[PDB]
Design a protein around this ligand. Structure first.
Ligand SMILES: O=C(O)c1cccc(O)c1
Ligand SMILES: O=C(O)c1cccc(O)c1
Lengths: 213, 213
């Protein structure tokens, strides 16, 4: 019954870990729907590039633009390093202790990398680091952290198996990094289209069925 | 001993499946080397953007540009679909039989998607398809193919576990799609730098230790 083309954008790590299997199951149940899916980590302007659904992962506050916003879930972040690296660099009891640790950075080389932390008694700390590895691929960062290259901040869901095995260890567990909000942004008119709506509703139902943090 | 910044580009699927663990191990053994790694599937111009090492995956023939070329390995491709999809769409004994099958496409939406095939007795076939799913992420394509959304062409190394389980099946096994060559392209002067060379040599040794096809 739903038929037409739907143009979607989604960050890479979220697509591989979560969104891909949703879209696969949707397309199996809606044979007449065509999906053009750009896997990119760039900020996408939905109105100009005529994007029907743009999935984003950003920390609050979020864009109060003219676009419609639907929240899909919250994902917490954490600072991790390997036991080997911890054995060499000392103890981390306050954010100041991270100064000088080798680090890894998610993004582009020209960016300024800073860990924003909130701790007990409403304490805030902002720790600048010069990472020796900079990339947008979360898989590569996790493998580098596993080898003890540097401390890195990753989404919890990306490292759950490693932390359970002990091959990665959480630093400063009493402090917390700002959480990220998985949300979908769409132009008001595009969501009216029947095919776009069916895709939108199915994602909402699938994300509601998840109990990830 | 090696120290400095090395700027590298690498396609996503190859980075996640292969190149990431190499760079991780290298950086653990060379603490003074900084790596800026862009994970992108775009054609990178190394000379203009001042890229030290650009890793590419393209079928032969390759660029005879002024850049230095080092071959790292050959990766064969194959056409796969799920048993369920095969049960619904009929039998595939010649490339003509693929006409009309729902398909998936690796790339951008505006591209023209054609399967180039070579068969027995030096027979060539070129099968145009209109894919209902278009993306650059290989993981998403594999999950869609697993759900029976469409026939897709993927690198063999990406589907070895699926084919062994039977959840994906190889179409037209007597025909072959052109193979892809993993190679690294670098400006002649940039490779002279000590840090770039150490990275280059380590990749050459690591890829030589692989016996992937
Ligand atoms: O929960 C996830 O799988 C996830 C994936 C990517 C980014 C992110 O913040 C969260
Ligand atoms: O052999 C691989 O892992 C590979 C990964 C990506 C592309 C490709 O042609 C091959």
């Amino acid at each position: 019954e739903p038929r037409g083309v739907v143009r979607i954008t989604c960050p890479v790590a979220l697509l591989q870990a979560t969104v891909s299997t949703m879209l696969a199951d949707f397309m199996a149940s809606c044979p007449l729907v065509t999906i053009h899916l750009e896997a990119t980590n760039r900020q996408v302007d939905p109105v100009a590039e005529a994007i029907d659904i743009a999935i984003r992962v950003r920390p609050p506050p979020l864009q109060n633009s003219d676009l419609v916003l639907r929240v899909l879930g919250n994902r917490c972040q954490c600072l991790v390093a390997s036991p080997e690296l911890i054995g060499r660099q000392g103890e981390v009891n306050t954010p100041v202790d991270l100064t000088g640790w080798p680090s890894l950075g998610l993004g582009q080389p020209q960016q300024t990398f800073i860990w924003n932390l909130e701790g007990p008694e409403k304490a805030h700390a902002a720790v600048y680091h010069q990472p020796r590895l900079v990339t947008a691929d979360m898989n590569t960062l996790r493998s580098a952290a596993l080898a003890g290259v540097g401390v890195v901040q990753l989404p919890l869901m990306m490292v759950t198996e490693q932390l359970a095995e002990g091959t990665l260890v959480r630093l400063l567990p009493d402090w917390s990094v700002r959480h990220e909000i998985i949300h979908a942004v769409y132009p008001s008119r595009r969501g009216l289209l029947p095919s776009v709506r069916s895709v939108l509703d199915y994602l909402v139902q699938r994300f509601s069925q998840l109990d990830e943090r």
